[PDB]
């Protein structure tokens, strides 16, 4: 029983941490394109 509980919790924690890291990278990438759009708008205004 101890090994069952320990195994299942460690596996779930590991998968949860992997998912959290992947989604944090995804969130950074999503902020990326909006910031790129703002920077492109600034460049476009300066060129105008």
């Amino acid at each position: 029983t101890t090994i069952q509980k320990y195994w299942r919790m460690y596996v779930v924690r590991r998968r949860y941490k992997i998912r959290r890291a992947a989604t944090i990278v995804i969130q950074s990438y999503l902020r990326g394109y909006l910031t790129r759009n703002r920077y492109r708008k600034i460049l476009r205004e300066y060129k105008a």
Binding site: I3, K5, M9, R13
Partner: protein, 147 residues
Amino acid sequence: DQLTEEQIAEFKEAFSLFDKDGDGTITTKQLGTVMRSLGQNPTEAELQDMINEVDADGNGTIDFPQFLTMMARKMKDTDSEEEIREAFRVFDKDGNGYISAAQLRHVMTNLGEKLTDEEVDEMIREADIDGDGQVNYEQFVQMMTAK
């Protein structure tokens, strides 16, 4: 015995993760999934004990203060992975650290907390155990040590 604000923030983050309703309530099954996700170390019987301690009022959902309370209890528990290694050695009939996957599955499922074959196959994949050939569990308990 109080959780550090870093662990408090991480556990509130997981709390919001499981806030499918979003009102600050956690189901008992949702609480068990949270327990597995956080790496805290209860027994299924201990899980039911924590559940009924929460449900002494009868709400059936877990709030954040009592959440921090049993998390303090759980870090006070502080199980050791060397005990897990000794349990494996007792489980290992050979005693050399190499035990067949069939024996592991049988002992793993037919004692106390029964497990589905899907979970056993997932553990085999995680522990790279071979059904026929003996595969050392020392690597998998080394990964257990990370918690």
